[PDB]
Amino acid sequence: LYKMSSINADFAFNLYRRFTVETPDKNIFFSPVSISAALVMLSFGACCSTQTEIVETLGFNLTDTPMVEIQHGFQHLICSLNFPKKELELQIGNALFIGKHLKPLAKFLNDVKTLYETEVFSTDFSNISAAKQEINSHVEMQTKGKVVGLIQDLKPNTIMVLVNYIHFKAQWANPFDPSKTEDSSSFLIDKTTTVQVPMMHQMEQYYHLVDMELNCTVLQMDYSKNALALFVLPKEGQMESVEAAMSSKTLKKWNRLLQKGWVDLFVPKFSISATYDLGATLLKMGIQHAYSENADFSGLTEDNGLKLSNAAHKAVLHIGEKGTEAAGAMFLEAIPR
Amino acid sequence: HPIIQIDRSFMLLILERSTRSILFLGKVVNPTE
Ligand SMILES: COc1ccc2c(c1)c(CC(=O)O)c(C)n2C(=O)c1ccc(Cl)cc1
Ligand SMILES: [Ca+2]
Numbered sequence: 311l312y313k314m315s316s317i318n319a320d321f322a323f324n325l326y327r328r329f330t331v332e333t334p335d336k337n338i339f340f341s342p343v344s345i346s347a348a349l350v351m352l353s354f355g356a357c358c359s360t361q362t363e364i365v366e367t368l369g370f371n372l373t374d375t376p377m378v379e380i381q382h383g384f385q386h387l388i389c390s391l392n393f394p395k396k397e398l399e400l401q402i403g404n405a406l407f408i409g410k411h412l413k414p415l416a417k418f419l420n421d422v423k424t425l426y427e428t429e430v431f432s433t434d435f436s437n438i439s440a441a442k443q444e445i446n447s448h449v450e451m452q453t454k455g456k457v458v459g460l461i462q463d464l465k466p467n468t469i470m471v472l473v474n475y476i477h478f479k480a481q482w483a484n485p486f487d488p489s490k491t492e493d494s495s496s497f498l499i500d501k502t503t504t505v506q507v508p509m510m511h512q513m514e515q516y517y518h519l520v521d522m523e524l525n526c527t528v529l530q531m532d533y534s535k536n537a538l539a540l541f542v543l544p545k546e547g548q549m550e551s552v553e554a555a556m557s558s559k560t561l562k563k564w565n566r567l568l569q570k571g572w573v574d575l576f577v578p579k580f581s582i583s584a585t586y587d588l589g590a591t592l593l594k595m596g597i598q599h600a601y602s603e604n605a606d607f608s609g610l611t612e613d614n615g616l617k618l619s620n621a622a623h624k625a626v627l628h629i630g631e632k633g634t635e636a637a638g639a640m641f642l643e644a645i646p647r
Numbered sequence: 648h649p650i651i652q653i654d655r656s657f658m659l660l661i662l663e664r665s666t667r668s669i670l671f672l673g674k675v676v677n678p679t680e
């Protein structure tokens with residue numbers, strides 16, 4: 311799990327940096343665990359270079375962490391994340407919508423159900439519009455209402471859909487007093503423009519740092535159990551330089567350096583959402599055979615008759631005085647090979 | 648005491664302790680988009 315931490319964090323930051331190129335100077339919000347977990351699920355049914363491409367794209371080196379250890383590690387991750395903890399709502403799981411005529415391997419279905427928190431639904435993709443609605447409503451349910459309309463379009467020849475969802479709701483260890491929230495305060499969106507946002511205010515002891523190298527302020531706010539938020543505030547004009555630096559290395563440096571002390575803290579109350587069409591991005595990052603006429607998903611179905619066609623993610627965030635609610639879902643679509 | 652005013656673009660990470668996992672990652676440019 312520790313090795314998986316650094317690798318999964320560095321995937322997160324490499325994907326982040328892809329998004330800063332695709333949607334420059336725009337809000338970014340995603341669950342890297344949801345994307346990583348979906349793709350590792352898909353890789354359980356893959357063989358040879360189709361399988362190795364997926365895990366190498368996720369940042370693993372198969373000499374250091376063999377394929378079966380990757381598999382084991384992600385199964386342990388999903389279990390741990392879902393283990394109940396008082397005062398934290400955290401669910402992460404998967405659903406496999408499989409065409410009524412496909413011939414899935416007992417092994418794959420037993421793997422995903424027993425070891426990867428997967429529900430399996432035989433789906434009639436001859437009714438594509440009904441299947442899209444069914445899948446979206448399932449994800450909406452599993453996210454406590456928060457991820458609506460995950461799938462905007464499904465290809466008419468779809469024969470399998472894999473979804474991962476994540477939902478998180480936690481209270482701050484030190485909640486804000488709403489009587490100190492300023493109804494309308496300025497937030498700078500670009501050099502000459504502000505928007506109005508409710509600004510929460512608390513003077514409290516927080517772990518915090520000024521990174522003297524990266525020219526940014528880092529502020530840690532704990533949730534009441536098993537979770538924390540990090541807020542990274544670059545100096546004026548320094549966001550791109552901070553974005554280029556972010557890595558597992560940086561996180562380990564901050565983990566050592568942050569010190570708890572009094573801070574007069576102002577934080578916005580706000581909600582945002584974001585959507586990503588990930589098909590081409592994942593191809594660029596190295597997942598190639600999965601999309602090809604020669605995809606090897608021999609571990610998934612008897613006839614190996616499917617290939618990946620599309621991939622998308624949606625994630626939502628709310629921060630207010632009591633805490634944070636966030637959710638995400640990832641969709642992978644497959645068609646006949 | 649030092650002031651920290653989160654009143655311009657910032658990055659956000661939500662982390663889980665038991666696995667040392669990034670649950671969510673983002674950047675807020677415009678909180679009212
Ligand atoms: C103050 O800066 C950090 C940075 C990362 C941290 C933490 C604190 C804490 C809280 C703590 O350790 O006190 C956890 C649980 N973090 C991680 O999840 C994490 C994830 C990936 C990597 Cl590569 C390294 C650490
Ligand atoms: Ca307090």
Ligand SMILES: [Ca+2]
Nearest residue numbers: 318319668669
């Ligand atoms: Ca992670």
Ligand SMILES: [Cl-]
Nearest residue numbers: 318342343669
């Ligand atoms: Cl992660």
Ligand SMILES: [Cl-]
Nearest residue numbers: 315319668669
């Ligand atoms: Cl991580």
Ligand code: NA
Nearest residue numbers: 412413611613
């Ligand atoms: Na088949």
Ligand code: NA
Nearest residue numbers: 431432433434
């Ligand atoms: Na069904």
